[PDB]
């Protein structure tokens, strides 16, 4: 079908050719995640997490659940956090309608991560933070990868890995997300 193919064609032209990520993406009706921007950003961040079916993922910023759905097709289980209640409800509902049942959602504050659920192999954060929430670092399993937009006015996507007990930071490319908001919930 055209739209699925057009989008995948687009991504490859942008330099995104991980067959894994492209298929995950192609399988998802993007237009459905507007029930009640750049699919490139989703592809790039997804690619950076270097996912494998054995990967335990924490996502911050469930939102429409689009990027959630992408993640779920790629790993055995996803844990996702959204601070806006109604958004959590929807996304939760969309995931069941697409028979995606390997996702645990939580209405809460991503700044705190989701400690209860063990260390995570991949951490994806889809809201900008001026500095890396240390809680997330603390929840990053050994050999784990974290992808996060960092900054205020200026923003850069970062990939951080925990290997040999050492955290290593790679600045990837300029972006612009809405802020990771701390404090109470809505
Ligand atoms: N502190 C926080 N903890 C968890 N989610 C937060 C947060 N601050 C903002 N958010 C949420 O992060 C989202 C950014 S939009 C994120 C896009 C989403 N991955 C999608 O595919 O649609 C917004 O829904 C916002 O409500
Ligand atoms: Ca590439």
Curated annotation (Swiss-Prot):
One of its GO terms (cellular component) is cytoplasm. Signal peptide: none annotated. The gene is pcm. Its EC number is 2.1.1.77. This is Protein-L-isoaspartate O-methyltransferase. One of its GO terms (molecular function) is protein-L-isoaspartate (D-aspartate) O-methyltransferase activity. Its main location: cytoplasm. Belongs to the methyltransferase superfamily. L-isoaspartyl/D-aspartyl protein methyltransferase family. The lineage of its organism: Bacteria, Pseudomonadati, Pseudomonadota, Gammaproteobacteria, Vibrionales. It comes from Vibrio cholerae serotype O1 (strain ATCC 39541 / Classical Ogawa 395 / O395). Keywords: Cytoplasm, Methyltransferase, S-adenosyl-L-methionine, Transferase. Gene3D superfamilies: Vaccinia Virus protein VP39 (3.40.50.150). SUPFAM superfamilies: S-adenosyl-L-methionine-dependent methyltransferases. The active site is at residue 37. It is found in: Cytoplasm. GO terms for biological process: methylation; protein modification process; protein repair. NCBIfam families: pimt (TIGR00080), PRK00312.1 (NF001453). Catalyzes the methyl esterification of L-isoaspartyl residues in peptides and proteins that result from spontaneous decomposition of normal L-aspartyl and L-asparaginyl residues. It plays a role in the repair and/or degradation of damaged proteins. It catalyses: [protein]-L-isoaspartate + S-adenosyl-L-methionine = [protein]-L-isoaspartate alpha-methyl ester + S-adenosyl-L-homocysteine. It is an enzyme of class 2 (transferase). PROSITE patterns: PCMT (PS01279). Pfam families: PCMT (PF01135). InterPro entries: PCMT, SAM-dependent_MTases_sf. The keyword Transferase applies.
